[model samples]
Target: LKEDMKMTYHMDGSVNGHYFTIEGEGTGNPFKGQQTLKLRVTKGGPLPFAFDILSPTFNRVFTDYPEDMPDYFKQSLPEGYSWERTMMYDDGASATASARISLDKNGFVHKSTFHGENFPANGPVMKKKGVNWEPSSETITASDGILKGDVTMFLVLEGGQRLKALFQTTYKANKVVKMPPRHKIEHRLVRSEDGDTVQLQEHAVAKYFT
Candidate 1:
């Protein structure tokens, strides 16, 4: 299937209550390789972080050191309204934990799920609990303070919509912010044949806070 694709999305949404604005891009069949993603929690102080995935997979996620990634945190995506992530965390320790989401032609969600695995190295708790990347139901928030279990996401070439790529992530502090504001999504599609600008470079699989 020569479905390799690329995409860039910008959204103004909230995480658990904290408002934020995100912009990203993706390339490749599954939106892998080089990546970019930035989130601004409106005038709020949301901890400062910077790191890079220099080895193994020279790819980065939403907040890490985007490296070659642009000043904005660009998201990378995949083929026709449906895509899955491809990235190994902790140097392969956090493998098998990823997300797969799809969108209908009408700009609605059809199906979404996570494929979790056991990490016995972290003991039974680790092995048993494993790592599951699912959508954030208003009740449970993931490492990234977003709602999950996928539904639908991406920008409409026509303009804006309600983007829902928010997932659960507790990779770090379990701090839950308060006061979720309004949200909106502005997106567009770039095909391999389009030869779009390098800024909206297609690529990425959210690493920590997807």
Candidate 2:
């Protein structure tokens, strides 16, 4: 929780029936200056890798939960297994966290498990190449390509399930960014209702650059 500190996380666990392992290394405060988090998720047996999300300015809520992870990674959870926020918080009383966060001997967050919530939780959906997954409501606050602060979004799935997503990114520089040649950026396609994520779209930024 301190500023300008170095942190690392490593987790190996299961949700529903799908097995997942998380490895993350970050530096600086997520709320300030030049923070970078590199995360990788390997599911099933690991021979065939799943996906990776790298953020130069990694900022988010639900950091320990899969909800905070990229949609593509969260979607890997089985039908009956998903991520949620309300499950982590209590309505009244002392309001202790429903979930427990375990840390390694070195004092870094390691893993988490949920209690109390009966059903799987859902989150935001993303678009695909030919398929258009539209959001019921989306609000973004950014300057050019850099996120100014946090962005929030809402989605209503075909089954009427409502989901939420928040983006917490901040830029260090003032000038607009131009993507480098052959830059690879990844995006996710999510079904907010069932927490289904399909296909990681790796885009070539220069292809659309002027």
Candidate 3:
């Protein structure tokens, strides 16, 4: 976790209705390799924030992509894309997850879609979240209209809990224009029913460099 290690963050407040809170920071080689994150969003606090800056460390849960995973993590997928499925949880009953990453043309990460909600009723079960050095060597493209790269993410909940982040995005058409901060973050703040939900606090650390 040291390759010139460096990371920073700041989140304001309010979500859904807008309002904002965002800071920035980054360096390199966090959680495995590659780093250069940056972030900027401000409006002066409200209380709803989300992050996934350079995220993913996988422990379990899968719907596929588990033939043994090797060959340099399946030759670092890209050309067309593959893998799909995975969802797990039980015990006390409580679930919520959302993931999205589809970048090609050079920005890396070809596809991903980890998703979940509620639980027990066997209502939600989908997959496609298994990132381990694929076309994602830190290169997200889209030029002209914005949408750069260097953004990792993941946020799985319910007992087994999980959250990973890393940033350096640019994004435009979809909003967000600057996101800095690379590596390590632990957060938690769930209220659900369609409101507060900001997980990431399993070893959480990132108050502005630790």
Candidate number achieving the greatest TM-score relative to the actual structure: 2
Give the higher-lDDT candidate: 2 or 3.
Answer: 3
Candidate 2 local distance difference test against the native: 0.28
> Taking the tens digit of each residue's C-alpha lDDT, what string does model 1 give over 1-210?
123433344333322233333334444342233332222223323312111110111122222222332211122212222223333333232321222233233221222222323323443222222121222212222224332222132212112222222222212112333312222111221222122221222232332233
Task: Rank candidates by lDDT, best first.
Answer: 3, 2, 1
lDDT of 1 at 200: 27
Better of 1 and 3 by lDDT: 3
In each prediction, how many residue pairs overlap at the backbone (N, C-alpha, C within less than 3 A)? 28, 0, 35
RMSD of 1: 19.3
Kindly indicate the candidate among 1 and 2 with the higher TM-score: 2
- Minimum summed lDDT over a 10-residue window in model 2 is located at 88-97
User: All candidates' TM-scores?
Assistant: 0.22, 0.30, 0.25
Per-residue alpha-carbon lDDT of candidate 3 for residues 49-122, written as tens digits (9 for 90 to 100)? 22332132110011112233211111322221222222233322222222222233323231222222332233
Off by over 4 Å in 2: 1-3, 30-35, 42-110, 113-210
Show the colliding residue pairs in model 2.
none
